[PDB]
Design a protein around this ligand. Structure first.
Ligand code: GFB
Ligand code: GFB
Lengths: 350, 350
């Protein structure tokens, strides 16, 4: 059959993988609160000549996420549910308020908005708005699940379709534990285990080095006097930065600081190898020189596969991440929540 | 001196004049609720080779709006307040949440967003978000004025700058009475009085005929089974359309229906002339033929000045508007609220 309560489908249409997963956590909680089945999103990759949509199940296990709330794959939704439950004629786009491009949602305007819905051959014929609902999409505390059910009954609205993820960004502390239900696919887990077995004598420290030019730019624009959250910064500084001040040294550690701190961590755990995940400079030669007194080496994947890297860092004896990066935030959350007890993590500059 | 509580400045960056005034009502109430002075917006005109910014005071009286809440002109703000209170270095843009274009507000992206802020020589250097405040910008019922003051103290944030008006669209019934405080400038009022004296024997019926091609398109896309608000439709059908169903005949009356209803209204009040305001077809010859049994004529401005037209319709013995048009909504509100008692109005198809 199909879910009489209906469905939610959305585009993780903001940012790269870290941003997508960060919003996806909130969407999961949203769908559960509305008691509608979530269509699992295609994730989006930008480092190709065109945008690339990746099936949820290529990366994560459907069985594990199902344990949190009802889900269906994108394949099952588009091939089996959509044609009868949600024909082209009632494909309404949902958004907060009508917007300047006729004022509406404009769901397929720009990238990745267009290519995402085009990939599943979906166009919208009308708009629905939810900005007038008391509490927005924040359904637990400021709880308005009754108001959503009342405004969008399942019979008239079997599918709620959002071109922006109906979840805060950055994520709220309350949804971080949902990372427990995102388990890497068998394929990725096995690649992680093989790389570790072949290359990383235990215990190993894994580090995330986020250092490409766009990043240095983002860090150097930190306004230390307003001290607002920046991407995942609350993962190390607490909600609203109650623990301290985000600095440039935390956001973008110098090469010398990275080395000092790696060597320090290797010493604290008696590490027998280091794993490096980087968006650009893995600093393998520099780290190896710094590691010579310990007669151990740093290792990376060539090429660096971002998903296997995340998985390897989740398995590390110690993880040292970048506090600002939502990419590091994935690891921090998995390390915190995948098991019954937290595996330890640290952050550069902290 | 200057307001120690600080300022709000915003772009009425959605839609044409009717949409701008409709949001501007909500902004006025918002500013009053936060007890900050509102910088009066430049209104925006699109029917030129480029976008044109119009000073508030060219159209409306500053003295009258001041009676509702503290305001300052755009000229006074940019020439006298801005340089010391809000230098280039602390010009932060405010928005609901970071968005896909680095994720931020992107306040000057597109039109009229760019040209509006460029007109007052303003660029933004950082972003602030308010989506995390319980209740959004809806400060009376769901009241979060304390939360705004706490998050944005006046000393660190002397100017709250919004590239989208911090007000619902379409407007909520609760702000419609604020139309009382928008009185046409002396210049427009006098033009209205002269046109009436010279051309419109009293009592006169004024009609708004909204009939250009973009409009017929918007009307023909009405989904009668979801029966959601469309622009100003709640002005005749009540909040959430509790009074009835929006139809195409209401949104886009036929020529025959327009004539029938004009003739009917002329008969009910013993009218001695008709005034027509139109975005395209004033139907002067057709209305005159239909009016021959009454030996009266229909009259229009050549060219049709939209502000003087609004003002003339506000002064009419009877107004017959278009329920869907926010342009008609201005007149309906002024007729309802400018005086101590409502002047009568009606709507085609109602
Ligand atoms: C500047 C801002 O940075 C934010 O990134 P941040 O939170 O680190 O995290 P993400 O949203 O994942 O964006 C960073 C992307 O860069 C690549 N990347 C980062 N670290 C690694 C790595 O260790 N290995 C590999 N192979 N790739 C990496 C990868 O595609 C990743 O999704 C953005 O999402 C914002 O939208 C904005 O662009
Ligand atoms: C299709 C939708 O229609 C909405 O318009 P709607 O609510 O009627 O009201 P407005 O937001 O004013 O947009 C209609 C504009 O068209 C012109 N116009 C309409 N009626 C008259 C008139 O009687 N005389 C003159 N001179 N000009 C008129 C004028 O520029 C007016 O601001 C838009 O604001 C939405 O953004 C969207 O475009």
């Amino acid at each position: 059959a199909t879910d009489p309560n209906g469905y939610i489908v959305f585009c993780p249409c903001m940012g790269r993988f870290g941003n997508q997963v960060d919003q996806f956590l909130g969407v999961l909680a949203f769908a559960k609160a509305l008691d509608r089945t979530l269509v699992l999103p295609n994730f989006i990759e930008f480092k190709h000549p065109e945008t690339k949509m990746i099936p949820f199940e290529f990366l994560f296990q459907v069985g594990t996420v199902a344990k949190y709330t009802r889900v269906v794959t994108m394949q099952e939704f588009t091939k089996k549910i959509m044609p009868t439950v949600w024909p082209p004629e009632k494909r309404k786009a949902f958004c907060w308020t009508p917007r300047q491009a006729e004022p509406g949602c404009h769901s397929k305007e720009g990238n990745p908005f267009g290519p995402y819905w085009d990939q599943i051959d979906v166009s919208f014929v009308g708009d629905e708005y939810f900005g007038d609902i008391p509490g927005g999409f924040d359904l637990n505390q400021m709880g308005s699940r009754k108001k959503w059910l009342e405004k969008f009954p399942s019979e008239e609205y079997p599918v709620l379709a959002f071109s922006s993820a109906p979840a805060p960004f950055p994520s709220k502390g309350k949804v971080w534990s949902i990372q427990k239900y995102l388990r890497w696919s068998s394929r990725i887990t096995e690649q992680a285990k093989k790389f570790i077995s072949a290359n990383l004598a235990k215990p190993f420290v894994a580090v995330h080095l986020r250092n490409d030019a766009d990043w240095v730019r983002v860090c150097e624009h930190i306004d230390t006097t307003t001290n607002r959250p920046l991407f995942a910064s609350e993962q190390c500084l607490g909600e609203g930065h109650h623990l301290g001040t985000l600095t440039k040294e935390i956001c973008s550690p110098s090469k010398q600081q990275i080395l000092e701190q790696i060597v320090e961590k290797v010493g604290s755990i008696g590490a027998k190898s280091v794993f490096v995940a980087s968006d650009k400079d893995h600093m393998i030669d520099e780290i190896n020189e710094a590691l010579k007194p310990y007669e151990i080496e740093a290792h990376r994947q060539e090429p660096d596969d971002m998903y296997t890297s995340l998985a390897i860092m989740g398995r590390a004896d110690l993880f040292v991440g970048n506090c600002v990066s939502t990419f590091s935030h994935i690891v921090k959350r998995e390390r915190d929540h995948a098991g019954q007890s937290p595996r330890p993590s640290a952050f550069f500059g902290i």
